[PDB]
């Protein structure tokens, strides 16, 4: 489970048995034709894969480019999170677990997990930072209808980091019954590999769809990056292909303000939630609070596979600010009639930063923005527009 | 054409006759134009997300001892079947040279679908919506605002869909040079019921190809909710006279005997509404009455004339379920399948309790998703008492 120097299993010893059991069960389903049959049927008819690769004619006109959007917003529940949640809750069911727990920030992982738990008939307890239960209220409502318990977490910065802290405490307290479902590619081995291997369907589809429109590989693929799962999923089949892969982190109020979530660009090597990776830390090794207008990007660490891709130059990383992402959310809504997630708006904002005239650019549209409507319409920057 | 037996026609102020003649001419032109269907079908595929899956609902199948399949129109862009029609009509509007779109909406799904198609095609868009529906369907008001549409709350009459359409039709008549009126359902003067039904019948054409892959035969039942009738017409039309039992489910509101429902086919009388001769809730002096439904998209006093004709000729069977039965089915699908359905669609799902389907293959049109309904449902007194 190492990506260069990053990754590993940096956990309390009591979890080692659970992780060994998960690693064995996962290696088992890796060759299990009936796991993949059932999983792939649900991806097709329940989640709605393959998702289209949409030529965004008006965006393309505005930038002078050929811009395609990989439409993960069209999945069931409205984000790429469902790819991973169905796969892991299916695994949990096959391992004989009876209960699921997870932490969630935008609420999309929580909704995806609650959906799979409902489908597979499992008890489901979702931890969510209290500030996130307010700016992402639509997803609290969906999780309640799906039968999940939602526990607001009032400690720390009351956002995703603190929700994951409490879900991990719950998992340790409940190891007999409970499977912990990470939403991103952060966590102790084998979780980064499991999540990335459920999300790489995105890149696999893209790789097949782009020669049908343009007859070669794209020039660029752009995806937003917090923990990194939607970006790992679309990048992984293109690593070392020569495509320019660009991961976009949350620059928040600005990378020099101290109010951002840009772990690769501004963090230091450290340990978070089981991985050795880049973490926003002070000079005494204390993890710092992140900030982003996007609840899904508001997390102080990043997946170890991305730390490794950055170090080896296989993927390039940069950031855009809260205001740039808000502008891109509004622009896509107005020009293409698609309301993007505020996470994915960071990737769309980056179109203004590359020299793309004449280029074929794929943007991973990781989810839809209905959860973000109240927050965007009330934001002071948008109110000053 | 225009007439489905004695139903339908063009019952409109004379000032609309010229626009309707130009519309029918333009439509007959595109119905043969490969360049139109190439652009349209490309958008249905990549923009809207078709074909939609036909999903085997294993837990619901186990509950009813049946094989229950859901046609997943909830998975379209914007979350309902309305986008099939909105993309096609705004594309036609563009081809006819119009620069502005107008419509009325109740659930707000047709409003959002029309607004997204207007945004895609660079047209001005003005949506009318009854004030009551702007409150119980607030999520869709917010979506339309981000899409760049103007949302006009309508404060007259019963402040729901019938009123909104009245105001959109007034706006159309005031703006006939620039503006294309987009109906959301199969109600209206000819050629609109045929246009709408012909954009929605992709639902049934897909279903007709998908169900042999899953069962090796036609289903025993196809069930869809009906107010205007567009999603039901879309899924039924390719199965007319096939021997499948087709069941349209109207809104029964508080009860077919309470006077508080929207069950036009079951309890209306012949009348004229919004251009069509069809079944309309009215008193015995010919005055249209206010409809009621817990579902904003079913809360309308008329029904499409093709449905009046299918009912009279027996080609489709019609019934109703109550508000409380629809709420129960809303909660049920959410808990059992992890799919939160529109409250409109929940009427069709609730009807699975009303027939004997043991050993039967049943397709239900899952016409939209229910995120717009969450706040209303969670605060409904009957859900609170549960
Ligand atoms: C952390 C969460 N969401 C993350 C997110 C992300 C960023 O997560 P990854 O860096 O793991 O893709 C991107 N797009 C959407 C629509 C998302 O919801 C959550 O739902 O708990
Ligand atoms: C009237 C509206 N909606 C109707 C509706 C209906 C009933 O309309 P038809 O009877 O035209 O399918 C069914 N399902 C969904 C998701 C709907 O939104 C509207 O959005 O304006
Ligand atoms: K981060
Ligand atoms: K009706």
Swiss-Prot record, chain B:
InterPro entries membership: Trp_synth_b_CS, Trp_synth_beta, Trp_synth_beta/beta-like, TrpB-like_PALP, TrpB-like_PALP_sf
Catalytic class of the enzyme: lyase
Pfam family, one: PALP
Keywords per UniProt: Amino-acid biosynthesis, Aromatic amino acid biosynthesis, Lyase, Pyridoxal phosphate, Tryptophan biosynthesis
GO CC annotations, alphabetized: cytoplasm
Cofactor(s) needed: pyridoxal 5'-phosphate
UniProt modified residues of type N6-(pyridoxal phosphate)lysine: 82
Keyword Kinase set for record: no
Record-linked SUPFAM superfamilies: Tryptophan synthase beta subunit-like PLP-dependent enzymes
EC identifiers of the protein: 4.2.1.20
Molecular-function annotations in GO: tryptophan synthase activity
UniProt pathway annotation: Amino-acid biosynthesis; L-tryptophan biosynthesis; L-tryptophan from chorismate: step 5/5
Keyword Lyase attached: yes
Top-level taxon in the UniProt lineage: Bacteria
Single Gene Ontology BP annotation: L-tryptophan biosynthetic process
Catalysed reactions, semicolon-separated: (1S,2R)-1-C-(indol-3-yl)glycerol 3-phosphate + L-serine = D-glyceraldehyde 3-phosphate + L-tryptophan + H2O
Disulfide feature: none
HAMAP family documented for this protein: Trp_synth_beta (MF_00133)
Self-association and partners: Tetramer of two alpha and two beta chains.
Family, per entry: Belongs to the TrpB family.
Described purpose of this protein according to its UniProt entry: The beta subunit is responsible for the synthesis of L-tryptophan from indole and L-serine.
UniProt xrefs under PANTHER family: TRYPTOPHAN SYNTHASE, TRYPTOPHAN SYNTHASE-RELATED
Name assigned to this protein: Tryptophan synthase beta chain 1
